[model samples]
Target: REHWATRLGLILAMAGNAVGLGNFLRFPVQAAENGGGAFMIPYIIAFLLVGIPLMWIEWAMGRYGGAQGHGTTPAIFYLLWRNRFAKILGVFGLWIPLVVAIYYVYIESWTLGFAIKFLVGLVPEPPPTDPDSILRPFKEFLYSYIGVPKGDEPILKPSLFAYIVFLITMFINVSILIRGISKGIERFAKIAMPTLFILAVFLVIRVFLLETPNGTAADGLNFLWTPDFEKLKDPGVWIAAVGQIFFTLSLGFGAIITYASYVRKDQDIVLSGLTAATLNEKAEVILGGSISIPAAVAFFGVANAVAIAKAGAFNLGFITLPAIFSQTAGGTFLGFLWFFLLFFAGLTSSIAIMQPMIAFLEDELKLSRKHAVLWTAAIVFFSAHLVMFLNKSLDEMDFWAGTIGVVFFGLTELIIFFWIFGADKAWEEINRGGIIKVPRIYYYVMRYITPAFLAVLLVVWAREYIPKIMEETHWTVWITRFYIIGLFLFLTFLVFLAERRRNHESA
Candidate 1:
């Protein structure tokens, strides 16, 4: 009987899930690191051929599954294929989000810490005039805040303050979830998504208007939009672009499918899917680049901004933005808005990531909603600590789960829905409840072109990274690898039990 209360909330919630930390933080980093113009070309191509087509495919698959009384991918996979092995194959839907949320929530807490710091004026006011000295204080604060290795501090040691913030964030995440979808996530989306857009627009205007000591807003926009044509020849640049598209669009993650399962059969998925995707692209391509990188370039200049981006995504976000805001008029308040905006963006996505697993517990294992939340929480709480303490754990998990894993899972979705599920039939499902017929060309695009593109992408990436995998000698790295393996095997076992249990009850 559970379903979305309204189309507006569903669209907002779906858009919120796609509009995550990746949009504001990771997109800028990818664009900067991969060469802005080079990344944009492949990114657009991937979005059209891979992201948009897959978005429709997942929506159609989910609606069909939901009508058949299944809410999660494993159950849906079994329903579609009638193969005993299909559910096991579908466990990526569970595994990817679960692994991602473990580290994702910890990063979400960082936004909360920054928000509170700015709101209270704990950050020193009035900017340092010397360009070299300007970013030093905020940089130190972040290094100490996250306890990154900058001194004699033990690598595994975490900031006690950060630990407390993580718990508070976790509590907030679960509390909203217990209320269920229509009242819980949908309600939060109606408020949070609109507010996120408003804050972003305000920040974009302020950043674009800035006249800085080193450069102007035009300098930043030029650096962001100008092409380094030579970089396009590198496969690494192409790989990075596709990876950014996956993270930015929330493709390959099962959250979209879970959310779509709540859609009523007659609802227009084509318009709904396109609308949500467009909103996310606006947030990422327009608002995302316009704010962070422009402000960084305006204050730091092109060379310095590139160095900050090279340090990592968090560098540009947590470090550089705070540095810029610390100097501007009414910057403390602006700093608060920036981080608080990130908190909303991060929180919405975190909630969606957790839902797919919770849906699995309730749909397949037949756990009560409350019981499912409890089980999901218990595992996430334990694993979050692992990601928090282990020095390399979060990055390691992000690469395997957030970066590579999503691509693999996205490919599998294409296989199941278009190949195994039958392309013409699946195409009909995509157009079934829509007001406008999707251009028929997308039907061929999904069936052949997209899968072949992913296949090549995977092969090239494997050639690129396999030697690096052999080079690793770190204990913590291996431990994270084993931890993910153990978790995957455990989930696979549960899927087996769930199938057997379903059969027993039927008999």
Candidate 2:
């Protein structure tokens, strides 16, 4: 029943939802591993063929749902398709975001912790003796922060400080949620998104001017731009490229759908969605791409940068970047800016991620805004500890919810919206608002090209990875999977109860 108070607020919040930790951390890590220039080829293609189309589709779906007094996916899905099981399928919308936030909020807390550490000069300086391995000091600090390798046989060693930061982060998120959308999410986005951009720009300017031990910042840019055309032959590169698009753009997750639900029915979703998508790309490619790898290569050279990147996102972000900053002239200042930027990015995104579930409780369960936020916060706080305390829980949860579950949910949405709901109708819905009219070819792209791309992607993913995943017998892995299913079933039961309540009220 609430609406975004302003168009700028809506766009910024939507862009904030899409532009997350992935832009800074995951995108460069993915680009490096998948072959930087080669990865961009498919990444751009997928963005046009799948990402933009889905953006508009979600916007259309959400505005329509909101006009009908529904902001969450279950009711929206059921409204679009009258099948008894339609809402059950829509559970993915709720479950994926909730599941991701369990770890995502935990990760968000890390950015806050790292930011404060940098401010207080607690981040260790890179030891001059270890010029050959610059990441060592920062890596050790990170390991210590996470309580890794310090006599831990009971799943994971608890980091009391990290837990405290997590609680602080959750309190901030929940407190904002209690304020409702216009006062909470949109208001926060209006400030946070702009501040994030300014901080990123300052860091980018600093990194761009830096000359380091092994290379110049320009040389790092050269590595990113230089084509490894041969690497494009690898199917995994293509998959990784598409998956990065999914991760960076927040596709296949229902956060976009929930955010768009606040738009006025006649508002220009086409241009608005495109604007938000473009903003995310700018942050990702120009800003994010310029910072991490360039700085790493500037300090450590291309080969060493590659190795650091291959170590993973946490390594690149929490470890390598801090080391690079430690050795830079304005190390303390730059380090603080970088982590604070990331904290802002992650904070905006985590809030958006938590909204769909809160919307569900408010819309379907008849809880007030305060009560819904409390329920959502309680659920996330409990589950997040599981992710925090367990060794492999983060990886397992991310693979299932953030990676694979998203692809499946994306395909289901395309099927329901384009096929079951009718492409002609969907196309009209997307283009209904007054602005720049979308080309008719995108209708074909949405109905045919996008779905085909997703199908091929799913096939490649299943063929390459499913068997290995299935064969895994790790206790933590199975524990994560069972917990996902348990949450899914619990949500499904709530859907059934909601339907029963609706029936009784109508009778």
Candidate 3:
């Protein structure tokens, strides 16, 4: 077994997968926009109820499958359930990351672009103290990179630099994928996790310390901490809280499962998975929550902070942060660090996302490592190209993939993991490595509460998006979802073939 060589390395690698854009940008935005302090109550509740239990379940499933030499969820599903049809559902574990990595790479590429441009002094320096100073350049840069007019039809083109960054991003992922687990992912995670934290803490100190005329730094702090109990009654708030936990911790992304698969038979998964999840939470709340919301308050007044938080995550990261950076001391240096931080965040996640496909090829399809890498690259680039031209409809793709697709898969797996795999067995698998004794209480928690939590999450998600998505839909929406769903089925078919082949050989 190609296991994690070091315990610290395993923890760091998993943490790197969790501490992504969702933590830094998305979590702060989620907390700020969803009634600030009101959100935290449900947020923490969801983490305990759903996030932790789900982590254990996925880790258990992955490890159990890996010992049998099954590296993917589809085959793992078949093996676990004694039903060939189970593999159909296992496609989700593959589909979720593929669609996410496609757009995630696009978003992360800006960080790559910003970092390079900054080093060359080619990045447009923001005006000393204007929000638009940063906003205008960011808008132009994003639009230019995607080859589009703001609020206009899809143009379906790419800038040379943006295209180059995409190539470089894929190259970085493929290089890492070929290195196998311990050497490639763990080594990169050790560096990236530490660097990401250092840069994160640096930003946190700056944001929390800043003072302004509109409101003191304390105002933003108070905003997040002040309990808006009235908003707590809103079920929507709780739903958002739960969803954020899933996204931030990468709980249902299946990357955790893939990474867990590489762990040694006697490794301590209970502690390691929890440690990774905890590090991500720490990064999200302390580093993530502290930075943007507070900076927005100090730099742009409380009133505008509300609007900025509402302005969307990409706006906060790409537009708001650079604007703030330009006004601060050593703006260029800070700007470089800011974008590079995102670069590290996104790159680590992207690398993890690609691993499942590579593993599947080697495990099920019996491809050589060289062939698996080649196959993974081909699939990623082709899928990316198909949707890249349709950037205007990316959210639809993200919705079906990252948001709805994620929760759907999460719910499905938890049900399968706990109910079919048997909670007693899951509990044993989680505790097998012999480190931290998981509390006896979670046995019931995984059996009942985890699935209930995911079901509620799925219901809330549908209530929130199903009507609105269709009401606001256009032809592009159909086109985008069609491609996404098609990709899922197409991949599932491949997994089925592999399953059939293996079954035939065994029989």
Candidate 4:
């Protein structure tokens, strides 16, 4: 009944969700910061080892689990231990997307606000006085007044306006999701995704054609393609690449599993997952990088691009891209295009994140779709406000939700599916009716190599954090870190218990 309804619909929906703000904004910045061309080495490696395989695994789980009308977490644990203890892990799966959606919608609201301002001519033009003039004053004003305040100065704060904007956009998103996959989600992706891509391509071309201060068309192109390889030796580069791949693909959050659960039995999930993952990565590396970085170079210069790159991926998207968009040819149209693309990306991904929880409520709790949607939206809406109000708290929450949550859950999914479920059977299920056949070598890789790598990376990354934690003696610092970590662990355990109970009852 909740099947994808059409194969194309499923593919587009999955791709739409996978291709989001991260693709256009986060990934390129990450690549550029990590060593530009040098980043590709680890990025491509992560894509093959972690990105594609995890996608396929999630897709396979969704298909098999959904066929039996099971929700995401229940399906994986059910397939594995089929015991109560194992199934409880699935409940933790639900928390990932819910937490993501809560903050994601808040960020989406920022895009919506910017879009409205641009459309209404409320947004100011690039200061004509100096071409390279950084809006240091404006930026400082926004941070001091609009964001978390560091001192006793109250400037032009828009926090109230920001919250209002966030809720309105979220309301629209929830409404669309209520209409279901075929009519609401798929239709929007089909129309918006292509339009967004076309706009990006057009803007990229414009950036290339525009003359730089040196009066050379090649200026922008040269700046964009120039790769710094010195970053290759840094382990942080690899970690960031892996994190980008994981984040951009929406892996380990149960979004893929939930979407794939709607796929028809005849559908080739392995192929679909591969296609989605490939398209997502290509969009990030090729389209996103080409557009954002080149435009930045053309507007500012190679020096500015390098300067922005050092701020990390988040700064690039939130600050650099916005700065670049304000100075591009057809500035208004491009500004509208840029923000609109972000809004759509956030909307589609938010839908994916919202689905698993909605599905669980309907299937397990026997709640009606309308009721489930309302309750879920209500919870997220209130939680989002709290997160927005506490900016520092939200940032800390995001670290756990974004990185730690992904790694922990991703590791768990791989473990339960491959080790506990038996690699051979899991492989068979994943490959059933798939157009792209994963080779026997992948089976070995998935079974032995992937888990080992994830395990080592987890330990290494954790060890890297130990020194920082030990040096912090302040009560406030320790309490904040402890709270964030504790919340994550508590949520993980809560879901584990829920799934365990469900599995026992079902068995």
Q: Which stretches of candidate 4 lie over 4 Å from their true place?
A: 129-134, 137-158, 214-231, 312-314, 466-507
Greater lDDT among 2 and 4 belongs to 2
lDDT of each: 0.86, 0.87, 0.80, 0.72
TM-scores for every predicted model: 0.97, 0.98, 0.95, 0.89
Ranking by lDDT: 2, 1, 3, 4
Q: Which candidate is the best by TM-score?
A: 2
Question: Model 1: runs farther than 4 Å from truth?
Answer: 124-127, 150-154
Candidate 2 lDDT (Cα, 0 to 1) = 0.87
Comparing 2 and 4 by TM-score, which wins?
Answer: 2
RMSD of 2: 1.4
Give the alpha carbon lDDT tens digit for every residue of 113-220 in model 4.
Answer: 777766665555456546436444235423532475565542223466676787798788888888877887888778867876786677567656655573333554
- lDDT digits (tens) for residues 1-507 of candidate 2: 898999899989999999999999999899887767777887888899988998888888889898887887899999889887789899999999999999999989988888888888877766564654666778788887776645545366656788899899999999777898899999999999889999999899999988955888898788787777787678888888888888888888899998888888888898999999999999999999999989888988888888888977699899888777777677877888998999989998999999999999988989899999999999999998778777778888898899998888988898899899999898889889848877878888998999998998899989987788889646568888889889999999988988998999999
Error of 1 at 91 (Å): 0.8
lDDT of 3 by residue, 215-317 (tens): 6667878888777778877878887888788888886677888888888776778888889888888988878888778888888776788788787667777
Clash count of each predicted structure: 0, 0, 0, 8
lDDT of 1 at 316: 94
Global Cα lDDT for candidate 4: 0.72
